[PDB]
Short mmCIF file of C-alpha atoms in Angstrom, two decimals:
data_model
loop_
_atom_site.label_atom_id
_atom_site.label_comp_id
_atom_site.label_asym_id
_atom_site.label_seq_id
_atom_site.Cartn_x
_atom_site.Cartn_y
_atom_site.Cartn_z
CA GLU A 1 118.17 53.39 166.53
CA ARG A 2 115.99 52.31 163.60
CA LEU A 3 113.64 55.22 163.17
CA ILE A 4 116.27 57.45 161.50
CA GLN A 5 116.06 55.36 158.31
CA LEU A 6 112.33 56.16 158.28
CA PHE A 7 112.51 59.85 159.37
CA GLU A 8 114.99 60.28 156.40
CA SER A 9 112.56 58.79 153.95
CA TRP A 10 109.74 60.66 155.48
CA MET A 11 111.36 64.00 154.77
CA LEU A 12 112.01 62.74 151.54
CA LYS A 13 108.39 62.03 150.97
CA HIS A 14 107.15 65.36 152.05
CA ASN A 15 109.79 67.51 150.25
CA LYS A 16 110.65 68.73 153.75
CA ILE A 17 114.22 70.11 154.23
CA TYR A 18 115.41 72.05 157.23
CA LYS A 19 117.21 75.11 158.08
CA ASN A 20 120.08 74.16 160.36
CA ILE A 21 121.51 70.51 160.98
CA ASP A 22 120.17 71.18 164.40
CA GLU A 23 116.61 71.41 163.32
CA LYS A 24 116.80 68.01 161.62
CA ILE A 25 117.62 66.63 165.06
CA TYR A 26 114.85 68.57 166.89
CA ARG A 27 112.51 67.49 164.08
CA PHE A 28 113.55 63.88 164.51
CA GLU A 29 112.93 63.88 168.44
CA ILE A 30 109.60 64.99 167.64
CA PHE A 31 108.91 62.75 164.64
CA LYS A 32 109.92 59.84 166.93
CA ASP A 33 107.66 61.08 169.74
CA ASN A 34 104.55 61.64 167.38
CA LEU A 35 105.44 58.12 166.01
CA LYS A 36 104.94 56.79 169.66
CA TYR A 37 101.69 58.56 170.08
CA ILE A 38 100.43 57.50 166.73
CA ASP A 39 101.35 53.85 167.10
CA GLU A 40 99.94 53.79 170.58
CA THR A 41 96.65 55.22 169.55
CA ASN A 42 96.17 52.87 166.54
CA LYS A 43 95.79 50.16 169.15
CA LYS A 44 92.49 51.64 170.45
CA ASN A 45 90.35 50.17 167.74
CA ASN A 46 88.33 53.11 166.69
CA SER A 47 86.84 53.93 163.21
CA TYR A 48 89.95 55.94 162.38
CA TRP A 49 93.74 55.86 162.63
CA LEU A 50 96.69 58.14 162.95
CA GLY A 51 99.60 58.05 160.83
CA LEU A 52 102.82 59.80 159.87
CA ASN A 53 101.49 62.75 157.77
CA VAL A 54 103.12 66.21 157.02
CA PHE A 55 102.53 66.98 160.80
CA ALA A 56 104.68 64.23 162.33
CA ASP A 57 107.31 67.04 161.74
CA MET A 58 105.56 69.08 164.40
CA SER A 59 104.73 69.10 168.18
CA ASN A 60 101.14 69.72 168.77
CA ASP A 61 101.69 73.39 169.92
CA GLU A 62 103.73 74.28 166.77
CA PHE A 63 101.06 72.65 164.84
CA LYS A 64 98.17 74.21 166.80
CA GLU A 65 99.31 77.78 166.28
CA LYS A 66 100.53 77.59 162.49
CA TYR A 67 97.76 75.58 161.08
CA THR A 68 94.52 76.32 163.33
CA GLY A 69 93.27 79.60 164.67
CA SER A 70 92.10 80.62 161.14
CA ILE A 71 88.74 81.52 162.74
CA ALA A 72 87.81 83.92 163.90
CA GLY A 73 87.67 86.96 164.90
CA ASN A 74 85.96 85.26 168.01
CA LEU A 75 74.07 90.40 162.01
CA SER A 76 70.90 90.94 160.44
CA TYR A 77 69.30 87.35 159.92
CA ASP A 78 60.33 66.81 153.80
CA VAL A 79 64.15 66.27 153.88
CA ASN A 80 64.87 63.61 151.27
CA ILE A 81 68.38 63.61 150.01
CA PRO A 82 70.82 61.15 148.53
CA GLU A 83 72.30 58.36 150.74
CA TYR A 84 75.75 59.60 149.54
CA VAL A 85 77.03 62.99 148.31
CA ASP A 86 80.61 63.39 146.98
CA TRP A 87 80.72 66.56 144.92
CA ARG A 88 84.30 65.69 143.45
CA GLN A 89 82.72 63.20 141.35
CA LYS A 90 80.17 65.49 139.74
CA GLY A 91 83.32 67.53 138.93
CA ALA A 92 82.88 70.48 141.17
CA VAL A 93 85.82 70.33 143.55
CA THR A 94 89.36 71.67 142.55
CA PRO A 95 92.40 69.93 143.80
CA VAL A 96 93.30 70.25 147.41
CA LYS A 97 95.16 73.41 148.30
CA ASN A 98 97.87 73.89 150.96
CA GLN A 99 97.18 76.88 153.06
CA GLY A 100 100.64 76.96 154.84
CA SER A 101 101.50 78.58 158.07
CA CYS A 102 98.86 81.08 157.27
CA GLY A 103 95.43 81.19 159.00
CA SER A 104 93.80 81.70 155.82
CA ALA A 105 91.54 78.67 155.95
CA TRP A 106 88.50 80.92 156.18
CA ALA A 107 89.43 82.09 152.74
CA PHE A 108 90.37 78.72 151.49
CA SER A 109 87.01 77.19 153.01
CA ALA A 110 85.02 80.04 151.07
CA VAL A 111 86.67 79.64 147.83
CA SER A 112 86.51 75.81 147.59
CA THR A 113 82.61 76.41 147.75
CA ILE A 114 82.55 79.26 145.29
CA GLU A 115 84.74 77.22 142.85
CA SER A 116 82.02 74.52 143.22
CA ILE A 117 79.01 76.50 143.00
CA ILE A 118 79.79 77.99 139.71
CA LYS A 119 80.36 74.70 138.30
CA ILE A 120 77.23 73.64 139.79
CA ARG A 121 75.65 76.70 137.88
CA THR A 122 77.98 77.20 134.83
CA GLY A 123 79.39 73.79 134.15
CA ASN A 124 82.77 75.12 134.58
CA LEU A 125 85.31 74.48 137.26
CA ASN A 126 87.76 77.21 137.83
CA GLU A 127 90.31 78.12 140.64
CA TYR A 128 89.91 81.44 142.25
CA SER A 129 91.96 83.67 144.63
CA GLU A 130 92.14 82.86 148.16
CA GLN A 131 95.08 85.55 148.39
CA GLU A 132 92.63 88.17 147.18
CA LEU A 133 89.87 87.41 150.13
CA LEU A 134 92.90 87.26 152.25
CA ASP A 135 94.40 90.71 151.30
CA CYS A 136 91.17 92.46 150.66
CA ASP A 137 88.36 91.39 152.97
CA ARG A 138 88.54 94.36 155.61
CA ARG A 139 86.48 92.44 157.99
CA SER A 140 88.87 89.60 158.48
CA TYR A 141 92.31 89.64 160.27
CA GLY A 142 94.17 88.20 157.30
CA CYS A 143 96.60 85.50 158.10
CA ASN A 144 95.66 85.52 161.69
CA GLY A 145 91.97 84.49 161.06
CA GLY A 146 88.92 85.59 159.38
CA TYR A 147 85.09 84.86 158.62
CA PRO A 148 83.95 82.51 155.92
CA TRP A 149 80.75 84.66 155.42
CA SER A 150 82.80 87.73 155.33
CA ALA A 151 84.50 86.11 152.33
CA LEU A 152 81.46 84.64 150.61
CA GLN A 153 79.70 87.96 150.98
CA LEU A 154 82.56 89.81 149.39
CA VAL A 155 82.39 87.80 146.47
CA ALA A 156 78.47 88.09 146.31
CA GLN A 157 78.78 91.88 146.37
CA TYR A 158 82.08 92.49 144.60
CA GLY A 159 83.34 89.22 142.96
CA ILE A 160 86.75 87.29 142.71
CA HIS A 161 89.75 86.80 140.43
CA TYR A 162 91.35 83.60 139.04
CA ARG A 163 94.13 81.93 141.25
CA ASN A 164 96.75 82.62 138.66
CA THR A 165 95.61 86.21 138.41
CA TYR A 166 96.02 86.91 142.21
CA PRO A 167 98.11 83.91 143.33
CA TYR A 168 98.48 82.79 146.76
CA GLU A 169 101.71 84.05 148.72
CA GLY A 170 100.68 82.66 152.20
CA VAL A 171 101.25 86.15 153.56
CA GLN A 172 98.57 89.14 153.66
CA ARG A 173 99.17 92.24 151.67
CA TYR A 174 97.59 94.97 150.03
CA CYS A 175 94.41 94.46 148.10
CA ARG A 176 95.51 94.39 144.42
CA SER A 177 91.82 93.57 143.26
CA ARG A 178 91.59 96.78 141.39
CA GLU A 179 95.02 95.93 139.77
CA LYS A 180 93.90 92.84 138.16
CA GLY A 181 90.87 94.26 136.08
CA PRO A 182 87.37 92.74 135.90
CA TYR A 183 86.29 90.14 138.35
CA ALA A 184 86.75 86.54 137.16
CA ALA A 185 83.53 85.64 138.67
CA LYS A 186 80.89 86.89 141.15
CA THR A 187 78.39 85.05 143.22
CA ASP A 188 74.88 86.22 143.95
CA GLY A 189 74.48 85.86 147.57
CA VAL A 190 75.17 83.85 150.79
CA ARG A 191 73.05 81.65 152.87
CA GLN A 192 73.54 80.01 156.16
CA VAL A 193 72.64 76.61 157.32
CA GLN A 194 70.48 76.10 160.33
CA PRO A 195 73.18 75.67 163.05
CA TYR A 196 73.37 72.80 165.25
CA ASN A 197 71.06 70.83 162.88
CA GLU A 198 72.55 67.99 161.10
CA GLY A 199 69.89 67.18 158.64
CA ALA A 200 69.93 71.06 157.85
CA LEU A 201 73.72 70.71 157.04
CA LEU A 202 73.12 67.46 155.17
CA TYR A 203 70.29 69.02 153.14
CA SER A 204 72.58 71.98 152.08
CA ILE A 205 75.32 69.63 151.19
CA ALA A 206 73.01 67.80 148.79
CA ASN A 207 72.80 70.96 146.78
CA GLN A 208 76.25 72.56 147.09
CA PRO A 209 79.37 72.32 149.11
CA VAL A 210 78.92 74.26 152.29
CA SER A 211 81.55 76.04 154.34
CA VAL A 212 81.72 74.69 157.84
CA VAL A 213 84.05 74.97 160.88
CA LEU A 214 85.48 72.77 163.44
CA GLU A 215 87.97 72.09 166.37
CA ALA A 216 91.06 71.08 164.38
CA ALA A 217 93.59 71.59 166.99
CA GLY A 218 93.46 67.93 168.63
CA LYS A 219 96.47 65.92 168.49
CA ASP A 220 94.40 63.13 166.92
CA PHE A 221 93.31 65.60 164.22
CA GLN A 222 96.73 66.50 163.14
CA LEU A 223 98.02 63.11 162.91
CA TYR A 224 94.75 61.93 161.18
CA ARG A 225 95.86 59.59 158.34
CA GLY A 226 92.47 58.07 157.64
CA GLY A 227 89.33 56.42 158.63
CA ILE A 228 86.16 58.09 159.90
CA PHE A 229 86.92 60.61 162.64
CA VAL A 230 85.07 60.47 165.73
CA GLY A 231 87.12 62.34 168.05
CA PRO A 232 88.32 63.32 170.44
CA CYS A 233 87.72 66.86 169.18
CA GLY A 234 85.67 69.31 171.25
CA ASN A 235 83.88 72.34 170.23
CA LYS A 236 85.93 75.43 170.51
CA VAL A 237 86.17 75.45 166.68
CA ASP A 238 89.09 77.25 165.21
CA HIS A 239 89.36 76.05 161.60
CA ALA A 240 87.34 76.54 158.45
CA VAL A 241 86.82 73.92 155.96
CA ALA A 242 84.39 72.93 153.18
CA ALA A 243 81.93 69.96 153.31
CA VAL A 244 81.83 68.68 149.83
CA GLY A 245 79.82 65.66 150.75
CA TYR A 246 78.62 62.97 153.14
CA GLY A 247 77.64 59.35 153.50
CA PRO A 248 75.45 57.68 156.32
CA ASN A 249 78.05 57.66 158.98
CA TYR A 250 80.14 60.62 157.98
CA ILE A 251 80.42 64.16 156.47
CA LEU A 252 83.13 64.41 153.89
CA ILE A 253 85.45 67.25 154.66
CA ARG A 254 87.94 68.94 152.44
CA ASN A 255 90.93 70.63 154.12
CA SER A 256 93.74 73.18 153.34
CA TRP A 257 96.67 71.30 154.54
CA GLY A 258 97.56 69.96 151.24
CA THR A 259 97.30 66.45 150.09
CA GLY A 260 99.91 65.33 152.74
CA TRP A 261 97.42 65.17 155.54
CA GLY A 262 94.25 63.16 156.35
CA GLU A 263 92.81 61.11 153.50
CA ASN A 264 94.67 63.00 150.80
CA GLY A 265 93.57 66.15 152.42
CA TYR A 266 90.04 65.02 153.20
CA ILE A 267 88.67 63.57 156.29
CA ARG A 268 85.26 61.86 156.84
CA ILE A 269 83.85 62.93 160.10
CA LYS A 270 81.46 60.89 162.09
CA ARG A 271 77.91 62.04 161.77
CA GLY A 272 74.78 61.59 163.63
CA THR A 273 75.96 61.35 167.28
CA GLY A 274 72.64 63.07 168.31
CA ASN A 275 75.39 65.71 169.56
CA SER A 276 73.89 68.88 168.31
CA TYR A 277 77.07 70.55 167.84
CA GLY A 278 78.07 67.67 165.53
CA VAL A 279 81.50 66.17 166.12
CA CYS A 280 84.12 68.89 166.53
CA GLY A 281 81.31 71.41 166.68
CA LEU A 282 80.98 71.08 163.08
CA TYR A 283 77.49 72.45 163.08
CA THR A 284 78.18 75.61 164.64
CA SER A 285 78.66 77.91 161.86
CA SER A 286 78.17 76.71 158.15
CA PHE A 287 77.58 78.99 154.87
CA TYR A 288 77.26 78.40 151.20
CA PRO A 289 77.48 80.52 148.07
CA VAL A 290 74.47 81.31 145.88
CA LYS A 291 74.67 81.81 142.06
CA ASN A 292 71.84 81.76 139.44
#
């Protein structure tokens, strides 16, 4: 019927083009079915809405397993902050990156905080290598998940290279670190936010983008167009992101699904539900870089 004129202009909009002629038909049947969900959910009147982003393309299971499950995996050991924080305005957030079908988000999450903290310490905003952390961190399982701390603690001890030195390939390989000469930057340590504490997390955002984790495999998450996300997500976190800010109702989240998802790649997640886990279990495991 109708919808074909839309689907066409939607592929068109997201530089999607398909393998067979038969996928374009599967993709459509999916598209149309995600459209129904979208449209039937944006009648519930909540603080956020779904929309046809880069994942209307995809059934939820498809989506589930190519874009979530970046963590893990599965050691040792007077709050008064701004009303709002958006680190992007202070010039310390690089443009959104697309992680692709790779569960690299643990690496992405880590770099988007390292990239930040050096500008928060050096004045100077660069883009470093996810691919490196990907290839080289031996504690992580590569494109099938990893550990933000592991990454952050690799840069603290070893360091990291510029994006265009060790560029992203969306596929794990050899550790070509030693082949790219001197590290581009190196951080001085890692800290952890007191988990299941919001004010703790808020506070640590106040100073520097924190690397947090959440349950990203909900259907409402994949089709998230905009608004303040309030659920329903659970708690079985499975995706690593960087909280580059907040405001009195939300925590501002930067994501790795490119600028075609969410609010241009961001998602403001509802905050202060007295839920200790934080919405989507956001408070369960949060870390930030240190630099002097």
